[PDB]
Amino acid sequence: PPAVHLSNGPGQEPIAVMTFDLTKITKTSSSFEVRTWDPEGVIFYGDTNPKDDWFMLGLRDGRPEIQLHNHWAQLTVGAGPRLDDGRWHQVEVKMEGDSVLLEVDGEEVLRLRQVSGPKRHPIMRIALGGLLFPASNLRLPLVPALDGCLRRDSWLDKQAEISASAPTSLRSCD
């Protein structure tokens, strides 16, 4: 299938931004394949409010890292095997009850429990390959640029998708 580069130019911004109608969401999971030799960077960032309800999945020291900041939890957690071996890796991130589940290559590697509740606005934004605020604003800053490739990505439900933007045309890893 067609693969896209996760970074463009200086790698200072996302390659794409998707907006979703929270009230129209029926599927709270996303999956994709990623390949990279880069040990650090942002795979995706998401929020309902950059001020107080945001989430980031990235790599640090080659391994998956999640940072989360919302009403119920504030955390910085590393888990899973290194993914920077230049091989394609399947990744799934989903909400399971009050938990966030991270699966890598079919195996559950991390489950953040009690991090959700009955999230700011009825709109969720998902940015690929970058953040929607300065990196200095992360709980634990890292350099966002992730020199890798993304393919076979499915995000929530297309029916709940409000819109999609791209600062520039998506560069193919072909």
Ligand X SMILES: COc1cc2c(cc1O)CC[C@@H]1[C@@H]2CC[C@]2(C)[C@@H](O)CC[C@@H]12
Q: Are 78 and 56 in contact (CB under 8 A)?
A: no
Pairwise CA distance, residues 79 & 160, whole Å: 30
Backbone angles phi, psi at 158, to 5 degrees: -55, -30
Q: Which range in 10-18, 80-88, 93-101, 163-171 contacts ligand X by CB under 6 A?
A: 93-101
Q: Are 67 and 60 in contact (CB under 8 A)?
A: no
* Chain centre distance of CA 17: 11
Using rule CB under 6 A, residue 76 touches ligand X: no
| Structure tokens belonging to residue 104 | 């890598």
The size of the interface with ligand X (CB under 6 A), counted in residues, is 19
Q: What is the number of the residue whose Cβ is closest to ligand X?
A: 46
Least distance in angstroms from the C-beta of 94 to a copy of itself: 14
* Residues in touch with a copy of itself (CB under 8 A): 63, 73-81, 107-114, 139-140
Residue 121 exposed, middle or buried by CB count within 10 Å (0-12, 13-18, 19+): exposed
Using rule CB under 6 A, residue 32 touches ligand X: no
Quick one: 70 or 86, whose CB is closer to ligand X? Answer: 70
Binding at 139: pick from a copy of itself, ligand X, Ca ion, none (beta carbon under 5-8 Å per type): a copy of itself
Task: Work out which of 56, 83, 91, 145 binds Ca ion, going by CB under 5 A.
Answer: 145
Quick one: 13 or 44, whose CB is closer to ligand X? Answer: 44
